[PDB]
Design a protein around this ligand. Structure first.
Ligand code: GTP
Ligand code: GTP
Lengths: 49, 427, 49, 36, 438
């Protein structure tokens, strides 16, 4: 989680204004319940050395 | 200064206003995004009467959207100008309507009147000093009549010193679609007659007849009807927002149309209606405008006042006119049908001259009428109630909600009083 | 025309130092403006005693 | 011209439909006046 | 939001429910797997399916209907079918024993230990739902298991949930065709139980469906495939308001308010006008006028009633497709001018219009036409009492000599309930007569 929010600067392929009047809750919603999962998670330099 | 705050109620008033604000915005020339394109000094001048200021030159519409059903508002927010409309102003209920008057007037309203009152006073405190309020809804509307009747009652004690403009469409006389619709009429118009000071009466059948006559386009949209009525409401509001030697304040007008308190129902009148060839076949001249202004066919409100007489006449003119063609034209019509006015009052004309023409046509006008032609209207419904109250159709719903036929007894009694009242004044 | 119209429209032409960045008028006019004097720049040289 | 509905979505337009699509006139051009 | 839950009871009521969902997945483009193409439609479950399907994070559209049956043959067969992967296995409630067409057997013997199971399903569906306007109940009077089992269910859902709607749909017993002579007994056993609890029951008859097939659809040898497709189109049309929009949008709450005149009777008639073969649609014309004439033509109604022998109270037309008020409002005005149509003077207006710009689509491998203007006619008339009048005379004969009674009493029931129900019909028929008296 720290890597995502702080280091990875969160999810790139996401659309920025993915939050607006929705369906059931006819308001700003479809922003984030999915959360990033992609990209090398465990690839700092100390492992290879 | 003196400003106006609007309320949109009922799912019709959802479609009514949405055409009506876009009419205002395009006339003032604001883009769909909201960044005003500065072209006219005077429209930048008196925009404050209806719009407040946001950051970056965006003028917020000072109106509040109230409903119960999502889809109707879902369209308007997804509509062309929903972005300029405020989600803060989108108050709604988490329930369906059922097109039942009591549910919206006693059941659903109770938990929503608190929110809307807190809302409307917030914009009331935001602005300084109103002329009053105006409402787009329907008397034959289920949720529109149910909510408005509650709100008009509550707004009376809150601010009894302003203008209670009401814009309601009368359903089609031949068929009302809704079968319990007349019951809604009684429940609405009974309470309307006390709380309101102004009421506009609109009928769709005439709008259909107008389409056959001058539109001649066979298949219109209801939005076209929204566009037509918006032009009518816009014209009377052009008075306030635009310069020219015309006295525009609604009370400056209301005292001029209302001789006695019970006169709340008024009929509109509009200016040149044209067909496909007539645009280049018409010499835009003061007589033919006024001739077309006073045409029983150009009537659009409820029915033909030929069966009755005229109480007051008031037409406001928009274009580059002078004080004398309006002067002579009234004499011509005054001499034309002098007898069809009432001998109670002579010279009942109330004219205002707006020198700022519209965008698309130059020479225009609007007329508001109070004639002796409303009798047949409530007469028509009167036989319905005397019929359908003879054996109490559809009663178990409302009575289950807590309705009693005693309420119906006074509501009809009040209207039959108005039946004689409108009758006695002229007859 | 809003509240306080006439001078606000008229002052911008006499006040010919408008900032370009948004909201920087206070930053620009933090030192102040020219209010306590005539619009003309110079009334010296008056050897009038 | 069936343009009378713009919010509708069909899927297969290759397969022909039926119906006698009425011609379309004007909606707000009447409100406008005489281009050129 | 705007959503409902459907229930399908008995082997009779399940194949039609499959067709409806099969029809429903066509206009929603649902592949048999359970996921859309690479096009983006999935999320928190928010699009046209959200009122019908539940395409959650698993990406699989979950239909909002429960299939309940007591005999595993058919339900396991569809569990081997094409769309079974979408269908939830224990939402496909099956049984191991029959009711032998005995209403009480399906009402007392076995339903007790099965209703608790479905009640868990109902509540576990209830928690995830938001708007939940009501229920879509498919059943049959001549239900070997449809009659008894659903009746107790309808009671239990009534007692716990009495603030929402319950929409009943069943095949009405054929006036002159009887697949069972125990079918008559359970029929009033259902009516007398359901009169004081059912919200809105909409009926239909198979013979007239066949009569349509070789009249205008021109099929002398159809099957349930067409039979279930046609009725599946009917419910699709009324549910298009939930799916799509139009000039005005209507909900079942408005249907229940404006259709039923008075308590007890909630039994209108349904009809779809543009029922016509394919080749006919090619070189012929559809417009509001003739279809209004057709829908009000007496032989186009699917229940054996003569409107000239009755009188109308309400009429609901759901114009699904591209129409305008002008011709519609003019045509209905001409309809009001007609003298043959004997509406009760009690109603000056009885017409409920629902406009929906969506026109119905064709189904691949289908037999319908290519419609642009479609309408569903919902109406209630007094010409229906003859059906109950046709009922009672077969019953008073059968009950006068106590046929099959040893069977029903052998499993623990008695005659008082049978005695009780007969005056209910007697109460029902005079009610029909008295309201017929203006
Ligand atoms: N929006 C809209 N309303 C229409 C149209 N034609 C007639 N109406 C009437 O306008 C009335 C006002 O709508 P609302 O007051 O918002 O309706 P409601 O309170 O939600 O309940 P109902 O009146 O039963 O629909 C409705 O009752 C309709 O009968 C139309 O084309 N568009
Ligand atoms: N709903 C429906 N009914 C059908 C179909 N085909 C025939 N029928 C009729 O529906 C009736 C079936 O009712 P029942 O036999 O009582 O069905 P059940 O109560 O669910 O249980 P079973 O006794 O096992 O069939 C028969 O009498 C047929 O006349 C069909 O596809 N769907």
């Amino acid at each position: 989680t720290y890597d995502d929010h702080y280091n990875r600067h969160n999810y790139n392929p996401g659309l920025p204004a993915l939050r607006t009047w929705n369906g059931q809750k006819l308001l700003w919603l479809p922003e984030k319940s999915d959360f990033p999962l992609v990209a090398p998670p465990t690839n700092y330099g100390l492992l290879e050395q | 200064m003196r400003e106006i705050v609007h309320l949109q109620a009922g799912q019709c008033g959802n479609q009514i206003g949405a055409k009506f604000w876009e009419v205002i915005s395009d006339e003032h020339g604001i883009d769909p995004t909201g960044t005003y394109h500065g072209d006219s000094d005077l429209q930048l001048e008196r925009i404050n009467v209806y719009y407040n200021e946001a950051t970056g030159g965006k003028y917020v519409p000072r109106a509040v959207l109230v409903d119960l059903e999502p889809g109707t508002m879902d369209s308007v927010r997804s509509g062309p100008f929903g972005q300029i409309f405020r989600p803060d102003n989108f108050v709604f209920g988490q329930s369906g309507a059922g097109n039942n008057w009591a549910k919206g007037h006693y059941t659903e309203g109770a938990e929503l009147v608190d929110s809307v009152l807190d809302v409307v006073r917030k914009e009331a405190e935001s602005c300084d000093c109103l002329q009053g309020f105006q409402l787009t809804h329907s008397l034959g509307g289920g949720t529109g009549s149910g909510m408005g009747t509650l709100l008009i009652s509550k707004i009376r004690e809150e601010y009894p010193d302003r203008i209670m403009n009401t814009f309601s469409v009368v359903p089609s006389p031949k068929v009302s679609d809704t079968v319990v619709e007349p019951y809604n009429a009684t429940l609405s118009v009974h309470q309307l007659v006390e709380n309101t000071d102004e009421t506009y009466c609109i009928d769709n059948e005439a709008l259909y007849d107008i389409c056959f006559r001058t539109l001649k386009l066979t298949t219109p949209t209801y939005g076209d009807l929204n566009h037509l009525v918006s032009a009518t409401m816009s014209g009377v509001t052009t008075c306030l927002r635009f310069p020219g030697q015309l006295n525009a304040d609604l009370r400056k007008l209301a005292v001029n149309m209302v001789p006695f308190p019970r006169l709340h129902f008024f009929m509109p009148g509009f200016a040149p209606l044209t067909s496909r060839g007539s645009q280049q076949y018409r010499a835009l001249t003061v007589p033919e405008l006024t001739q077309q202004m006073f045409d029983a066919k150009n009537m659009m409100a409820a029915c033909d006042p030929r069966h009755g007489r005229y109480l007051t006449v008031a037409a406001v003119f928009r274009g580059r006119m002078s004080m004398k063609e309006v002067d002579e034209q009234m004499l011509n019509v005054q001499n034309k049908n002098s007898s069809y006015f009432v001998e109670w009052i002579p010279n009942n004309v109330k004219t205002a001259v707006c020198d700022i023409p519209p965008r698309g046509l130059k020479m225009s006008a609007t007329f508001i009428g109070n004639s002796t032609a409303i009798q047949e209207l409530f007469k028509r419904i009167s036989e319905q109630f005397t019929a359908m109250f003879r054996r109490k159709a559809f009663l178990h719903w409302y009575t289950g909600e807590g309705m009693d036929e005693m309420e119906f007894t006074e509501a009809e009694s009040n209207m039959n009083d108005l039946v004689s009242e409108y009758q006695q004044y002229q007859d | 025309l809003l509240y306080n119209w006439e001078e606000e429209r008229a002052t911008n032409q006499l006040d010919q130092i408008p900032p370009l960045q948004d909201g920087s008028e206070s930053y620009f006019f933090r030192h102040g403006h020219q209010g306590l004097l005539t619009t003309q720049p110079q009334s010296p040289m008056s050897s009038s005693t | 011209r069936p343009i009378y509905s713009g919010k509708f979505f069909d899927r297969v337009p290759c397969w022909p439909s039926a119906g006698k699509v009425k011609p379309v006139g004007y909606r707000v051009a009447t409100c406008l006046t005489e281009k050129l | 939001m705007r959503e409902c839950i459907s229930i399908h009871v008995g082997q009779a009521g399940v194949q039609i429910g499959n067709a409806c969902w099969e029809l429903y997945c066509l206009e929603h483009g649902i592949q048999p797997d359970g996921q859309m193409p690479s096009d983006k439609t999935i999320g928190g479950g928010d699009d046209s399916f959200n009122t019908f399907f539940s395409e959650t994070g698993a990406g699989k559209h979950v239909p909002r209907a429960v299939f309940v049956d007591l005999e595993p043959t058919v339900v396991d067969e569809v569990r081997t079918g094409t769309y079974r992967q979408l269908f939830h296995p224990e939402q496909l409630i099956t049984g191991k024993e029959d009711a032998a067409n005995n209403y009480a057997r399906g009402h007392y013997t076995i339903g007790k230990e099965i209703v608790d199971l479905v009640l868990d399903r109902i509540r576990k569906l209830a928690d995830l739902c938001t708007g939940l306007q009501g229920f879509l109940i498919f059943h049959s009077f001549g239900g070997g298991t449809g009659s008894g089992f659903a009746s107790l269910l309808m009671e239990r859902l009534s007692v716990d949930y009495g603030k929402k709607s319950k929409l009943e749909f069943a095949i009405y017993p054929a006036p002159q065709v009887s697949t069972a002579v125990v079918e008559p007994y359970n029929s009033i056993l259902t009516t007398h139980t359901t009169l004081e609890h059912s919200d809105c029951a909409f009926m239909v008859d198979n013979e007239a469906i066949y009569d349509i097939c070789r009249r205008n659809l021109d099929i002398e040898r159809p099957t349930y495939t067409n039979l279930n497709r046609l009725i599946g189109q009917i419910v699709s049309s009324i549910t298009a308001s939930l799916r799509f929009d139009g000039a005005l949008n209507v909900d079942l709450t408005e249907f229940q308010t404006n259709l039923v005149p008075y308590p007890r009777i909630h039994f209108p008639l349904a009809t779809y006008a543009p029922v016509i073969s394919a080749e006919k649609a090619y070189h012929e014309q559809l417009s509001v006028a003739e279809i209004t004439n057709a829908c009000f033509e007496p032989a186009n109604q699917m229940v054996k009633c003569d409107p000239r022998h009755g009188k109308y109270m309400a009429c609901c037309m759901l114009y699904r497709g591209d129409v305008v008020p002008k011709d519609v409002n003019a045509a209905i005005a001409t309809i009001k001018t007609k003298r043959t149509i004997q509406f009760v003077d009690w109603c000056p207006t009885g017409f409920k219009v629902g406009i929906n710009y969506q026109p119905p689509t064709v189904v691949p491998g289908g037999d319908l036409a290519k419609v642009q203007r479609a309408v569903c006619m919902l109406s209630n008339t007094t010409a229906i009492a003859e059906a109950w009048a046709r009922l009672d005379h077969k019953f008073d004969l059968m009950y006068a000599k106590r046929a099959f009674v040893h069977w029903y009493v052998g499993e623990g029931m008695e005659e008082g309930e049978f005695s009780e129900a007969r005056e209910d019909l007697a109460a029902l028929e005079k009610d029909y007569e008295e309201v017929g008296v203006d």
